[PDB]
């Protein structure tokens, strides 16, 4: 998995709300399943394979969570962030 190689997700930033800083990418056995945006220094709940997983982001978009085997969700700051 190489995030610098991964294409940007399909995103639309809503005009009213603060612009999320991160791209996340979700893999099953190193195959890209989904991708999106999330806040840095924050927290989200996500469906990761079979589980509803609570995920923390640090200020450099490092995602941590208790992912089920074979799955991972990885982050990075969007361009210019």
């Amino acid at each position: 998995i190489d995030l610098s190689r991964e294409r940007d997700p399909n995103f639309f930033d809503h005009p009213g709300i603060p612009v999320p800083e991160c791209f996340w990418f979700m893999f099953k056995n190193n195959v890209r399943q989904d991708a999106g945006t999330c806040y840095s220094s924050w927290k989200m709940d996500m469906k990761v394979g079979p589980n509803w997983v609570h995920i923390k982001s640090d200020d450099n978009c490092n995602l941590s969570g208790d992912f089920p085997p074979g799955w991972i969700v990885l982050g990075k700051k969007r361009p210019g962030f």
């Binding site: 639309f12 809503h14 009213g16 709300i17 999320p20 989904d34 806040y39 924050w42 469906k47």
Partner: protein, 75 residues
């Protein structure tokens, strides 16, 4: 208390697709509804006040299939 909720909704057509949008957008507290996804099978719902369990359950009965993908409170 604004939150973003992404739901995977069975909507093959553009016409069950507009069904899902207007239905998600009828929910109390919603600010916007957008469809995204390579397969355009995602509803993105933003608002404050929304019960995600209620969102999905409604879309479920009215479109047949709906699963929560993510809930992110707006920072």
């Amino acid at each position: 208390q604004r939150t973003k909720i992404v739901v995977k909704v069975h909507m093959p057509c553009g016409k069950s697709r507009a069904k899902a949008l207007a239905l998600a957008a009828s929910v109390n507290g919603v600010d916007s509804v957008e469809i995204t996804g390579e397969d355009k099978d995602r509803l993105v719902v933003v608002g404050r006040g929304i019960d995600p369990v209620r969102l999905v359950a409604l879309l479920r009965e009215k479109c047949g299939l709906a699963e929560l993908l993510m809930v992110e409170l707006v920072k």
